[PDB]
Amino acid sequence: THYDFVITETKVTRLCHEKTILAVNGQFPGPTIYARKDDVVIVNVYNQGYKNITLHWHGVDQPRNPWSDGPEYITQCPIQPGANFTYKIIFTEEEGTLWWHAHSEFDRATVHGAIVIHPKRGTVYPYPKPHKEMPIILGEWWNADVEQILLESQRTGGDVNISDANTINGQPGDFAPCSKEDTFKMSVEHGKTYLLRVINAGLTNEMFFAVAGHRLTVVGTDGRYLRPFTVDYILISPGQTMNMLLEANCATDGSANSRYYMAARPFFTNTAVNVDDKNTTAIVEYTDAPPSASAGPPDSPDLPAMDDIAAATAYTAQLRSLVTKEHPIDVPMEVDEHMLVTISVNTIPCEPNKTCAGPGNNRLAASLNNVSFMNPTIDILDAYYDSISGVYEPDFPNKPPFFFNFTAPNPPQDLWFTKRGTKVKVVEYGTILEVVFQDTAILGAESHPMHLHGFSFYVVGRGFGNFDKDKDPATYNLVDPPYQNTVSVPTGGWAAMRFRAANPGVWFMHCHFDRHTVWGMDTVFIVKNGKGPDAQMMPRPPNMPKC
Ligand SMILES: *[C@@H]1O[C@H](CO)[C@@H](O[C@@H]2O[C@H](CO)[C@@H](O)[C@H](O)[C@H]2NC(C)=O)[C@H](O)[C@H]1NC(C)=O
Ligand SMILES: *[C@@H]1O[C@H](CO)[C@@H](O[C@@H]2O[C@H](CO)[C@@H](O)[C@H](O)[C@H]2NC(C)=O)[C@H](O)[C@H]1NC(C)=O
Ligand SMILES: *[C@@H]1O[C@H](CO)[C@@H](O)[C@H](O)[C@H]1NC(C)=O
Ligand SMILES: *[C@@H]1O[C@H](CO)[C@@H](O)[C@H](O)[C@H]1NC(C)=O
Ligand SMILES: *[C@@H]1O[C@H](CO)[C@@H](O)[C@H](O)[C@H]1NC(C)=O
Numbered sequence: 001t002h003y004d005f006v007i008t009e010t011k012v013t014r015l016c017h018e019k020t021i022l023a024v025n026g027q028f029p030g031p032t033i034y035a036r037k038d039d040v041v042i043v044n045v046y047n048q049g050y051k052n053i054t055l056h057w058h059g060v061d062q063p064r065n066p067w068s069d070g071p072e073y074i075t076q077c078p079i080q081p082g083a084n085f086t087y088k089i090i091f092t093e094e095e096g097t098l099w100w101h102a103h104s105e106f107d108r109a110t111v112h113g114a115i116v117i118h119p120k121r122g123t124v125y126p127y128p129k130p131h132k133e134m135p136i137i138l139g140e141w142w143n144a145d146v147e148q149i150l151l152e153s154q155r156t157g158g159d160v161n162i163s164d165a166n167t168i169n170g171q172p173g174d175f176a177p178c179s180k181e182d183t184f185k186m187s188v189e190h191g192k193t194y195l196l197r198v199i200n201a202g203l204t205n206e207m208f209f210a211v212a213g214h215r216l217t218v219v220g221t222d223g224r225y226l227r228p229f230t231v232d233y234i235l236i237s238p239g240q241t242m243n244m245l246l247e248a249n250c251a252t253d254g255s256a257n258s259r260y261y262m263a264a265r266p267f268f269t270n271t272a273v274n275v276d277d278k279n280t281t282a283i284v285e286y287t288d289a290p291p292s293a294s295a296g297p298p299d300s301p302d303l304p305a306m307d308d309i310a311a312a313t314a315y316t317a318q319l320r321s322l323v324t325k326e327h328p329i330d331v332p333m334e335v336d337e338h339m340l341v342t343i344s345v346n347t348i349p350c351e352p353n354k355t356c357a358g359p360g361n362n363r364l365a366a367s368l369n370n371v372s373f374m375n376p377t378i379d380i381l382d383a384y385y386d387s388i389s390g391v392y393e394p395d396f397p398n399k400p401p402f403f404f405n406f407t408a409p410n411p412p413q414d415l416w417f418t419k420r421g422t423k424v425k426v427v428e429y430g431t432i433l434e435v436v437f438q439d440t441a442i443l444g445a446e447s448h449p450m451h452l453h454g455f456s457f458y459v460v461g462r463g464f465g466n467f468d469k470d471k472d473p474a475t476y477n478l479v480d481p482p483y484q485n486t487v488s489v490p491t492g493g494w495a496a497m498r499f500r501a502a503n504p505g506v507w508f509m510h511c512h513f514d515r516h517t518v519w520g521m522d523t524v525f526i527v528k529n530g531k532g533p534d535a536q537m538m539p540r541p542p543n544m545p546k547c
């Protein structure tokens with residue numbers, strides 16, 4: 001239950017391009033954290049790299065413990081080069097796959113890895129114990145330094161350059177230049193079942209994923225078991241994890257291929273904007289088959305077309321919490337407070353004496369309820385703890401300031417603009433929230449993967465168009481809605497979720513597309529202390545990074 005994570009400058013080559021990246025212990029992707037349900041894990045982080053950095057344990061509630069949650073300028077100031085910080089990871093309700101990643105700038109492009117939370121001693125999986133288990137991390141690779149990719153978009157005010165490859169476990173796969181030799185490969189044995197722990201650690205796109213010749217029985221997401229269902233492909237959004245069983249059924253006698261492509265490719269609908277549409281591949285290989293069975297190329301799956309919204313919707317519609325006596329559910333039935341949160345890509349005016357590259361030559365931005373989040377320079381959590389004025393404003397609104405036909409295509413240019421602020425939403429301990437995310441069509445309808453730190457939540461409804469507060473709740477799933485930490489809000493649509501705010505602390509909420517995070521598609525929940533020691537935020541650890 002103790003790890004040393006040294007942030008290192010590491011030379012890595014992909015697509016024949018060598019560069020120095022930040023990595024953990026020289027590994028890209030980084031090491032997997034292994035735990036069992038309800039463990040406490042300690043990670044000493046030593047920043048031996050060239051820049052400010054933080055680490056985040058994605059999907060871990062961290063009860064009463066925002067100090068170890070990670071998001072830069074939200075719960076901590078950064079770990080400076082040459083400094084160190086000890087994170088305490090408090091696992092509670094989570095069982096399944098999570099992941100960890102840098103939570104500063106674009107550093108998580110290479111600084112990330114898996115978290116595996118096994119059943120605790122004396123308990124078992126709700127499904128037959130898999131023969132083997134394999135993290136399958138979907139990611140992106142840029143030939144350029146990711147810091148320079150970010151910095152250039154900051155200077156120009158235009159869009160972030162697309163990645164050069166999509167990757168599986170850091171490897172672009174068979175169809176990329178200078179990649180075929182090191183494609184990720186896993187061995188399978190006829191008749192055995194494998195748990196694929198799929199993590200979308202890319203920065204930019206939701207991804208379709210499939211394995212040639214093999215159906216996938218999905219059994220969990222975001223550290224919570226799901227009602228099992230079997231499919232030919234999955235959809236998975238940045239931030240999300242999906243666990244699924246693969247049954248190695250194919251014949252190893254020479255009558256069938258012995259190699260099968262695992263493959264992923266983006267789900268993306270904005271035909272006017274560039275996208276890294278390259279597929280990424282890995283190889284599932286039956287090892288006990290005759291060498292003639294691997295004579296040709298591996299079999300290829302049928303992936304949905306990149307713009308197949310129906311295929312995305314059809315996967316997401318199947319997600320439901322597993323509800324049993326060993327795995328109960330607690331859907332909040334009486335809501336204390338409703339929020340409608342419009343999600344928009346935006347512009348702000350270009351700075352004086354400068355030309356910008358965003359739409360209308362303005363500067364790109366993004367917003368929740370038309371507030372474009374701006375990081376403070378004193379982190380929110382310290383400001384809240386010390387009662388420091390002038391850092392944040394505690395009036396993030398429960399509804400957008402101006403109602404309009406949110407999802408009507410091509411809104412007029414005047415609705416593009418937003419305004420920066422550092423606003424948070426303060427709630428009393430135990431408040432039951434229904435949060436409805438409403439995509440707008442400003443600058444293009446788009447599915448946003450909205451993520452809430454400190455909590456998972458029940459996704460009780462979703463639809464296309466404008467949420468109707470007097471009609472859509474009538475068909476909410478109040479019985480077994482999926483319990484997630486990151487929700488794909490529909491393209492040009494809405495998603496409703498509920499949770500009890502019973503974790504005292506300071507909790508980031510944001511789109512998990514990093515470009516939207518930095519553009520300001522974020523806010524913060526401050527959950528005040530309740531009554532009793534169990535409802536009190538932990539005290540500040542002695543050696544927090546200084547601001
Ligand atoms: C989001 O906020 C922006 C900025 O406050 C709003 O744009 C302003 O709208 C007012 C009223 O029409 C104008 O007088 C200002 O000139 C605008 N500021 C600009 C363009 O920078 C925008 O209308 C809001 N959008 C919503 C609520 O959808
Ligand atoms: C790395 O992080 C530190 C801590 O947040 C930054 O240092 C602070 O910068 C602010 C200005 O934004 C100053 O008011 C503080 O006095 C600084 N504190 C220090 C130097 O201990 C630093 O700017 C960050 N580095 C980069 C390159 O962004
Ligand atoms: C970690 O940082 C502290 C200061 O916060 C320092 O005192 C300590 O020696 C460091 N640990 C090392 C270098 O192993
Ligand atoms: C981003 O892409 C453009 C090509 O469209 C290129 O001119 C530019 O150099 C790229 N930026 C970086 C930082 O590599
Ligand atoms: C991936 O893309 C390459 C290049 O377009 C294509 O030749 C290959 O068939 C694709 N692989 C899969 C599994 O879709």
Ligand SMILES: *[C@@H]1O[C@H](CO)[C@@H](O)[C@H](O)[C@H]1NC(C)=O
Nearest residue numbers: 349350351352353354355356
């Ligand atoms: C900067 O912008 C102002 C306002 O548009 C303009 O009057 C001024 O000439 C500019 N400065 C230059 C071009 O050096």
Ligand SMILES: *[C@@H]1O[C@H](CO)[C@@H](O)[C@H](O)[C@H]1NC(C)=O
Nearest residue numbers: 404405406407408409465466
């Ligand atoms: C809102 O926009 C949609 C899509 O353009 C349109 O079909 C609908 O009629 C609009 N609703 C109103 C009230 O104008």
Ligand SMILES: COc1cc(/C=C/C=O)ccc1O
Nearest residue numbers: 158159345357358359443444
């Ligand atoms: C990815 O974000 C966007 C970029 C642009 C392009 C701006 C430069 O012209 C347009 C719409 C978007 O949603």
Ligand SMILES: [Cu+2]
Nearest residue numbers: 058101239512
């Ligand atoms: Cu995350």
Ligand SMILES: [Cu+2]
Nearest residue numbers: 058059452453
């Ligand atoms: Cu998170």
Ligand SMILES: [Cu+2]
Nearest residue numbers: 071451453508
């Ligand atoms: Cu986050």
Ligand SMILES: [Cu+2]
Nearest residue numbers: 448511513516
């Ligand atoms: Cu987004």
